Amino acid sequence: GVFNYETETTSVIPAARLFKAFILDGDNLFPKVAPQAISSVENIEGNGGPGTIKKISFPEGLPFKYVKDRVDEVDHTNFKYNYSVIEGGPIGDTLEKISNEIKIVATPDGGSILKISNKYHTKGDHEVKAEQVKASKEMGETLLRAVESYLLAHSDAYN
Amino acid sequence: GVFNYETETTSVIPAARLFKAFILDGDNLFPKVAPQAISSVENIEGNGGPGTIKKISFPEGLPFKYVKDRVDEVDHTNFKYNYSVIEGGPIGDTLEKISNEIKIVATPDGGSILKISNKYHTKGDHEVKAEQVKASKEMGETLLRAVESYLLAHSDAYN
Structure with missing residues (x-):
């Protein structure tokens, strides 16, 4: 089946600047600002737009090797x-x-x-475990906060 | 007027893998593998394909602030x-x-x-100085060698 889970998180950073740093430049930023979460982001295919495939690796300790x-x-x-x-x-x-x-x-x-x-x-009637959902929200928050701290300490960045 | 300057440099890395790491992922890589040359690469507009504008900053010592x-x-x-x-x-x-x-x-x-x-x-009949041309070739070589060392030490990368 298909299961939808939603969340909303707040940021002090204005929309335009956040979009450029977090979304458009997240791949470049994450391994630098949040090394404890993302070890490396590798481009497998594409330029960065629709159709692009990327390999995200997680540092030694994290539960998954890559995605x-x-x-x-x-x-x-x-x-x-x-x-x-x-x-x-x-x-x-x-x-x-x-x-x-x-x-x-x-x-x-x-x-x-x-x-x-x-x-x-x-698959069919199988469900996802709440920990899986929770971990995705956690990962998202830590990345956003990391990018957020970066922008606040580098007022000239993405501006 | 218009002045064309050409160069060719050799690499041990096969074409496909080099293209993916050096070209498609150069922006993400350069600040990491060659910090003494590129301090940061900031995306200003676009996803990474044609039409994209990027701000490349150089570390404190280098002659130019950004490009x-x-x-x-x-x-x-x-x-x-x-x-x-x-x-x-x-x-x-x-x-x-x-x-x-x-x-x-x-x-x-x-x-x-x-x-x-x-x-x-x-502008009109003005020419460029050989040092300018030379510096661009130098910059290119150092980046290529840096990406080259990275790939050799990380055999799983871009592969």
């Missing part, structure tokens, strides 16, 4: 980013793939909120 | 990469821009050679 993502859509105009986890990691057995959608919305105070949507494609 | 490049073409099929230096660095006064073309060719022994072409657009 492969496909960029499905990059909407600069609406600050929307769609990608799918298609191999490695939790992919296998009863889980075929994970389709994710992140949309950055500007808030009245000048900050932003990220509307995240995780769509799981499981 | 802005535009990706003109990315030919995965023919291992060709075209980009232009359009702002900052040597751009100004009598130099409008620099158009570069790098083409990776496989050699009989399993290695590669990079055919580099630097095209300068100067």
Whole structure:
């Protein structure tokens, strides 16, 4: 079946700047700003736009060795980013793939909120375990906070 | 006027793997493997394909503060990469821009050679100084060797 899980997280950074650093430059940034989460991001195919496949490796300790993502859509105009986890990691057995959608919305105070949507494609009536869902939210938060600290300490970056 | 300067450099790495790491992932790699040359690469616009603008910053000591490049073409099929230096660095006064073309060719022994072409657009009859040309070749070599050492020490990378 298909299972959708949603979350929203807050950021002090305005939408445009966050989109450029977190989304458009996340691959370059993550291994640098959050080494305890992402050890390396390797480009397997594409330039960075739709159709691109990337191999994300996790440092020695993390539960998964690697994961492969496909960029499905990059909407600069609406600050929307769609990608799918298609191999490695939790992919296998009863889980075929994970389709994710992140949309950055500007808030009245000048900050932003990220509307995240995780769509799981499981085997028949099999379900995903809450820890799996929780770990994805955790990973997302740590990366956002890391990129957030970076931008605050480097006021000239992505500006 | 327009002045064309060409060079060719050798690499032990086969064409496909080199293209993926050096060209398709150069932005992510350079600041990591050659910190004494590139301090940071910032994405200003685009996903990584044609039309993309990037801000390359140089570490404190290097002669230029930053430079802005535009990706003109990315030919995965023919291992060709075209980009232009359009702002900052040597751009100004009598130099409008620099158009570069790098083409990776496989050699009989399993290695590669990079055919580099630097095209300068100067004011009327003004010429570029040989040191400027020389510095671009130097920068290119150090980056290639850095990426080369990386791949040799990480046999699983881009493979």
